[PDB]
Design a protein around this ligand. Structure first.
Ligand SMILES: Cc1cc2nc3c(=O)[nH]c(=O)nc-3n(C[C@H](O)[C@H](O)[C@H](O)COP(=O)(O)OP(=O)(O)OC[C@H]3O[C@@H](n4cnc5c(N)ncnc54)[C@H](O)[C@@H]3O)c2cc1C
Ligand SMILES: NC(=O)c1ccc[n+]([C@@H]2O[C@H](COP(=O)([O-])OP(=O)(O)OC[C@H]3O[C@@H](n4cnc5c(N)ncnc54)[C@H](OP(=O)(O)O)[C@@H]3O)[C@@H](O)[C@H]2O)c1
Ligand SMILES: [Zn+2]
Ligand SMILES: [Zn+2]
Ligand SMILES: [Zn+2]
Ligand SMILES: [Zn+2]
Ligand SMILES: [Zn+2]
Ligand SMILES: [Zn+2]
Length: 255
């Protein structure tokens, strides 16, 4: 891993907690769905975390979709994460450290032939799919594309305008769906992805089945969502985890 100096060119504050950074950095070409590392000097030490590219690999304007992390530590204190709020405080012109070579296997080349490719994401994890769909390479292999974005509230569906523009571009091949867990909102299904798969509601709304005979499922995001969806698909649909030596029906990347 080689660190290069990047320059923030744009900061888009979708909500109080959700933001996308546009960066100029001399990174190497990458495969859509891959991630790199962003770094900032905090108390004299470089602090680094992984962030997925949201931009098509053919676009030199690097885009990152992030959330300022908040958690309850072991002492019972409610605290912010180390790097995310520092990334949220960057302004155009500010420097950010970027790893030149991308990493990751959450890519189309790892996806076998299928009728329907399901792209399921929570929160900021819609990013890799947007990189894949914007580029449009190798989607000819799949008859149907389903992009599902789950978040807590409708206001958190930051890329809904891009999803709508991608739906128009794909002329019916791409089906889009938003999911909201903490409210009811017009145009969105209410709940969590595993429960909506199990109840048959997601498939009924989309108009396509999710089964081992026709589908490949990509999972990105919340580690509990990834773990719960993989357990449901294995237990109830006999869909196996795709691992380095054992191919399968599910490709996962937790954040
Ligand atoms: C391959 C990969 C790709 C990723 N891509 C992105 C991306 O594109 N966009 C993005 O926003 N994040 C992404 N992440 C997460 C990212 O790398 C950071 O973990 C995140 O920004 C928090 O780092 P931090 O320094 O702010 O928090 P830290 O100081 O590291 O605190 C993390 C603590 O809070 C918990 N935690 C971490 N994330 C969350 C969360 N989202 N919700 C609740 N608790 C959490 C951890 O379990 C840990 O206990 C990705 C992670 C991986 C593994
Ligand atoms: N400061 C703020 O106002 C603010 C706002 C948003 C986020 N944050 C911080 O950002 C972080 C994560 O935020 P996020 O909302 O982007 O991502 P997230 O917590 O992963 O939630 C995204 C979606 O995933 C769902 N989910 C959670 N566990 C699941 C499981 N086991 N199975 C299926 N779906 C599951 C959530 O449902 P549920 O509704 O059931 O959780 C929600 O619909 C946290 O650190 C949070 O505290 C802060
Ligand atoms: Zn520049
Ligand atoms: Zn540019
Ligand atoms: Zn702990
Ligand atoms: Zn190298
Ligand atoms: Zn076919
Ligand atoms: Zn081709």
């Amino acid at each position: 891993a080689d660190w290069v100096t990047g320059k923030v060119t744009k900061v888009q504050n979708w909500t109080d907690a959700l933001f996308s950074l546009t960066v100029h950095a001399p990174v190497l070409p990458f495969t859509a769905g891959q991630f790199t590392k962003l770094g900032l000097e905090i108390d004299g030490e470089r602090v680094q975390r992984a962030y997925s590219y949201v931009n098509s690999p053919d676009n030199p304007d690097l885009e990152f979709y992030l959330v300022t992390v908040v958690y309850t530590n072991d002492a019972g204190e409610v605290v912010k994460g180390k790097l995310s709020p520092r990334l949220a405080a960057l302004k155009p012109g500010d420097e950010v450290q970027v790893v030149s070579e991308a990493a990751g296997f959450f890519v189309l080349d790892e996806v076998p032939h299928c009728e329907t490719l399901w792209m399921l994401a929570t929160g900021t994890a819609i990013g890799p799919y947007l990189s894949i769909l914007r580029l449009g390479k190798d989607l000819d292999r799949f008859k149907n594309l389903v992009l599902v974005h789950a978040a807590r509230y409708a206001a958190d569906l930051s890329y809904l305008p891009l999803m709508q523009e991608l739906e128009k571009r794909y002329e019916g091949k791409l089906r889009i769906q938003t999911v909201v867990s903490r409210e009811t909102a017009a145009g969105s299904l209410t709940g969590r992805i595993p429960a909506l798969i199990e109840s048959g509601e997601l498939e009924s709304t989309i108009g396509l089945p999710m089964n081992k005979e026709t589908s490949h499922v990509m999972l990105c995001g919340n580690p509990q969502m990834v773990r719960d969806t993989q357990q449901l698909l294995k237990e109830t649909r006999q869909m196996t985890k795709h691992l380095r030596r054992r191919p399968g029906h599910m490709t996962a990347e937790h954040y």
